[PDB]
Amino acid sequence: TRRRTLYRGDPGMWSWVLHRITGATIFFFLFVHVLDTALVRVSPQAYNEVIETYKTPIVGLMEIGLVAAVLFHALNGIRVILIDFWAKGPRYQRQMLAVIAGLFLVIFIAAVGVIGMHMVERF
Amino acid sequence: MVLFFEILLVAAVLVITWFAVYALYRLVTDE
Amino acid sequence: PELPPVPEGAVMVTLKIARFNPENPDAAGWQSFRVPCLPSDRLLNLLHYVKWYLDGTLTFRRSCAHGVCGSDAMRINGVNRLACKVLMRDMLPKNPNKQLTITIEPIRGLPVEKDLVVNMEPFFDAYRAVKPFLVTSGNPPTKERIQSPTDRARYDDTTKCILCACCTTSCPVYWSEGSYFGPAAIVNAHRFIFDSRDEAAAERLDILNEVDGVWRCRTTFNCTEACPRGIQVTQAIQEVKRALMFA
Amino acid sequence: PRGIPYFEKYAWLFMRFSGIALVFLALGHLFIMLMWQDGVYRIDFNYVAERWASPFWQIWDMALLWLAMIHGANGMRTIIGDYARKNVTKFWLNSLLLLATGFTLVLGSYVLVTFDANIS
Amino acid sequence: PYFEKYAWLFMRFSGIALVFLALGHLFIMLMWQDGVYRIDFNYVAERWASPFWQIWDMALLWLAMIHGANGMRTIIGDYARKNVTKFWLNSLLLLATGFTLVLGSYVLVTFDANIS
Numbered sequence: 001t002r003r004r005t006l007y008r009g010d011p012g013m014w015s016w017v018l019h020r021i022t023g024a025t026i027f028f029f030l031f032v033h034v035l036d037t038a039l040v041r042v043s044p045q046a047y048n049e050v051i052e053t054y055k056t057p058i059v060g061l062m063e064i065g066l067v068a069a070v071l072f073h074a075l076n077g078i079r080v081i082l083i084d085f086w087a088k089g090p091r092y093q094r095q096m097l098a099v100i101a102g103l104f105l106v107i108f109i110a111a112v113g114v115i116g117m118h119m120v121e122r123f
Numbered sequence: 124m125v126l127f128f129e130i131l132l133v134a135a136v137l138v139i140t141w142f143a144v145y146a147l148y149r150l151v152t153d154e
Numbered sequence: 155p156e157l158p159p160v161p162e163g164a165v166m167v168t169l170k171i172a173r174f175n176p177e178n179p180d181a182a183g184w185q186s187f188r189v190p191c192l193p194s195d196r197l198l199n200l201l202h203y204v205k206w207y208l209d210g211t212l213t214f215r216r217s218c219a220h221g222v223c224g225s226d227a228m229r230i231n232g233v234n235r236l237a238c239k240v241l242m243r244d245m246l247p248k249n250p251n252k253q254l255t256i257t258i259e260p261i262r263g264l265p266v267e268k269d270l271v272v273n274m275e276p277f278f279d280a281y282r283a284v285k286p287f288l289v290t291s292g293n294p295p296t297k298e299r300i301q302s303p304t305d306r307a308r309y310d311d312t313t314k315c316i317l318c319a320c321c322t323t324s325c326p327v328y329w330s331e332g333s334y335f336g337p338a339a340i341v342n343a344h345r346f347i348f349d350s351r352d353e354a355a356a357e358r359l360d361i362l363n364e365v366d367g368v369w370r371c372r373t374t375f376n377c378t379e380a381c382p383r384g385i386q387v388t389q390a391i392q393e394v395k396r397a398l399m400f401a
Numbered sequence: 402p403r404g405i406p407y408f409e410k411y412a413w414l415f416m417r418f419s420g421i422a423l424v425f426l427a428l429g430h431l432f433i434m435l436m437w438q439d440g441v442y443r444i445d446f447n448y449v450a451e452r453w454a455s456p457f458w459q460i461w462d463m464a465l466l467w468l469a470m471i472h473g474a475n476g477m478r479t480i481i482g483d484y485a486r487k488n489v490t491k492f493w494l495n496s497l498l499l500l501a502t503g504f505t506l507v508l509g510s511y512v513l514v515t516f517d518a519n520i521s
Numbered sequence: 522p523y524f525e526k527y528a529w530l531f532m533r534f535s536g537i538a539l540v541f542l543a544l545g546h547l548f549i550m551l552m553w554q555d556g557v558y559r560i561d562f563n564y565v566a567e568r569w570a571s572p573f574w575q576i577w578d579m580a581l582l583w584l585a586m587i588h589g590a591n592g593m594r595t596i597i598g599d600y601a602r603k604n605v606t607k608f609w610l611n612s613l614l615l616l617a618t619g620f621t622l623v624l625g626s627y628v629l630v631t632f633d634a635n636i637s
């Protein structure tokens with residue numbers, strides 16, 4: 001028997017689950033992408049072939065998704081490092097969390113705007 | 124050749140999506 | 155039998171218990187009861203109503219009137235609560251005549267033995283594995299060995315633990331694999347590590363310095379949010395981490 | 402006393418310090434790649450070759466590779482330790498992780514160290 | 522603690538890898554076209570102009586040297602009677618192994634075909 005139920009606890013819990021998910025995302029991408037970059041010790045034409053197949057609109061929205069993942073992971077990791085090293089850290093947990101929510105929204109709407117204007121002028 | 128790397132890309136996306144749903148599943152199931 | 159009692163002003167709140175019979179059927183499942191509520195009630199009063207009048211196979215732990223001992227930790231609407239404190243005085247959605255429902259079920263992480271009763275012996279085994287007692291010399295001073303009012307106020311705030319497990323059973327690291335000690339064991343070890351008149355601080359810190367010790371905390375604050383005494387469980391964990399870093 | 406003593410303390414500290422460094426490394430990489438001149442739409446072999454003709458970017462990319470791979474490998478070690486139920490499964494998954502991480506570090510280091518602009 | 526368990530496991534895993542590495546090396550060297558009678562600087566230079574053979578030889582060097590050094594550590598531990606003898610023999614082994622790994626890695630990493 002296995003019951004299925006949602007705990008509905010702190011917001012730091014959802015921060016941690018997003019942290020874990022985005023970290024694993026970047027790890028798998030990094031494996032694949034170090035390979036395709038290692039294709040540069042083979043041929044300029046091989047490298048150009050591959051990275052040109054990386055210039056499609058699907059891969060563009062995926063670039064936006066990966067930008068989001070790395071940005072959230074970086075901000076939340078700063079929060080975690082602060083909690084651990086700063087002695088008054090655990091008191092301002094939720095303050096830091098709201099601050100990095102704000103920073104993420106700002107920087108990410110800016111980054112989507114820039115990447116979007118590039119994708120627009122490229123079509 | 125390019126086909127190998129697009130195959131690698133879709134495999135990476137499947138592994139990524141599987142891990143996301145598996146982490147959430149292990150979070151919500153009572154074991 | 156005869157008849158349930160007379161209500162005075164009732165809202166007829168509904169409870170959803172997660173029943174599980176250990177022997178008669180092993181066919182668990184949810185069961186919904188309808189009980190009257192008041193402004194001056196609590197989930198313990200409502201579970202008492204259920205157990206006395208309607209049901210009577212329903213078991214759960216409770217001792218104290220309101221001098222807290224920590225026996226009735228439950229999961230009430232997702233979070234761990236200590237059912238004697240949920241304080242239904244705050245039911246404003248009662249007035250719009252919406253059907254109110256409360257969801258009760260055992261705490262998560264420990265083996266269930268019946269409805270709302272769990273097996274606390276894993277919890278207490280993890281507790282009595284950080285050596286939660288004062289280890290000292292062997293010839294006591296006959297007159298209460300000395301300690302400053304400054305060294306005394308250091309391990310305060312972890313002397314409030316009633317050992318209810320509302321914290322350990324909200325730790326995702328505890329739901330996970332391996333054997334994490336838990337927030338409560340780490341709190342009751344902080345109490346003794348930061349006690350001046352102790353001679354096993356280093357040995358306790360060496361117990362907490364393993365693979366399944368204090369380094370498995372993923373800095374979720376579920377424990378802090380769940381503690382009914384307000385202990386700052388994760389700041390206790392942080393202080394133990396920093397005592398292991400800078401020492 | 403289940404593993405090497407004081408290994409968990411230093412893995413913990415390494416995650417913190419490599420995070421502090423990887424903020425700059427990874428976010429500067431993403432910025433300069435995606436939102437400087439034409440983003441991806443300028444990238445090709447000539448771009449890579451004129452970027453890797455600079456000690457700055459060479460050391461930047463090697464530090465990024467090593468820090469990111471050791472960081473991710475330690476994080477996935479933690480994830481495996483939290484999700485694997487059988488000891489045989491944990492053993493073989495940690496071995497697969499170690500193999501893939503070693504292969505990626507070897508390939509990336511080879512490419513960086515041996516890259517020559519004039520190949521054809 | 523746990524150093525012997527991992528040295529044991531390393532001998533097993535490096536053996537599995539060294540089967541392919543060392544036996545492919547010996548095959549391609551001794552019984553492919555003219556064996557040794559074709560080998561010279563030009564042969565080495567056109568073999569080491571390939572990422573395949575470069576990585577093959579570096580993996581062979583590192584795995585073979587760490588494997589042999591661990592095995593000889595075991596042999597010394599089983600044959601040396603005095604603790605001072607064991608200390609100085611393990612130090613000589615560590616020195617020779619480090620010197621060989623340093624020299625082989627230098628040669629591989631720095632080799633240039635156009636030397637004269």
Ligand SMILES: CCCCCCCCCCCCCCCC(=O)OC[C@H](COP(=O)(O)O)OC(=O)CCCCCCCCCCCCCCC
Binds near residue numbers: 460461
């Ligand atoms: C464990 C820690 C590991 C640290 C690794 C992190 C490295 C991250 C990136 C750092 C790269 C450093 C390489 C420098 C190469 C370079 O800039 O030099 C390369 C530059 C080209 O830079 P750009 O193309 O980006 O403009 O060449 C120049 O023309 C520079 C003009 C003068 C610069 C003098 C610098 C020489 C040494 C001084 C170093 C300053 C450090 C001071 C410390 C007190």
Ligand SMILES: CCCCCCCCCCCCCCCC(=O)OC[C@H](COP(=O)(O)O)OC(=O)CCCCCCCCCCCCCCC
Binds near residue numbers: 039572573574576580
């Ligand atoms: C702990 C693990 C350490 C691993 C070290 C062991 C290495 C043993 C020898 C293997 C060497 C591998 C280097 C590859 C270089 C090469 O192929 O290249 C080597 C060859 C030249 O060698 P030859 O002419 O002799 O065949 O170059 C080519 O002509 C190949 C054509 C295109 C191939 C592109 C592949 C580039 C990278 C993509 C890898 C995809 C495989 C994925 C597998 C997971």
Ligand code: HEM
Binds near residue numbers: 441462463509512
């Ligand atoms: C859309 C996003 C990205 C693009 C387009 C991209 C593109 C590139 C390019 C063009 C290079 C090599 C050329 C150079 O370095 O000048 C490269 C190499 C590298 N990138 Fe990225 N990158 C992206 C994201 C990332 C991320 C998120 C990481 C790590 C978290 C990363 C890590 C690396 C590393 C380590 C290398 C070195 C490769 C090697 O040494 O073989 N990149 N990537």
Ligand code: HEM
Binds near residue numbers: 424470
């Ligand atoms: C290549 C880039 C990165 C990769 C591959 C990566 C991967 C991971 C993974 C898989 C984890 C495990 C998550 C968990 O255990 O819950 C993790 C944790 C962590 N990451 Fe990263 N991450 C990267 C970048 C960063 C950055 C830029 C920071 C900035 C501070 C950071 C800070 C942290 C911290 C502090 C942890 C520890 C979290 C914890 O212990 O709870 N990471 N990382």
Ligand code: HEM
Binds near residue numbers: 574583624629
């Ligand atoms: C008759 C037998 C052998 C001959 C004629 C031979 C010949 C060679 C040659 C020609 C090279 C360098 C050229 C190249 O790699 O393409 C070389 C290098 C190498 N060989 Fe052998 N080999 C023999 C046996 C072995 C054995 C048995 C091993 C290890 C068990 C071995 C390990 C190595 C290593 C590690 C290198 C790399 C040298 C370096 O990096 O400086 N060889 N040998």
Ligand code: HEM
Binds near residue numbers: 532533544596
């Ligand atoms: C070619 C494939 C090879 C395989 C499959 C292999 C396998 C093994 C294994 C499993 C052991 C452990 C024996 C034990 O613990 O009882 C061993 C020991 C040893 N190996 Fe290897 N090995 C290989 C090549 C090499 C090479 C290339 C060297 C040296 C350059 C080497 C040197 C040694 C030594 C000195 C021992 C110690 C023997 C002992 O302690 O009894 N082996 N080998």
Ligand code: SF4
Binds near residue numbers: 320338387
């Ligand atoms: S710490 Fe707070 S919550 Fe955890 S047990 Fe002691 S009292 Fe209950």
Ligand code: F3S
Binds near residue numbers: 321371372377387
């Ligand atoms: S609930 Fe769990 S993991 Fe850390 S801070 Fe509290 S212990």
Ligand code: FES
Binds near residue numbers: 221
């Ligand atoms: S009744 Fe004893 S604590 Fe709730």
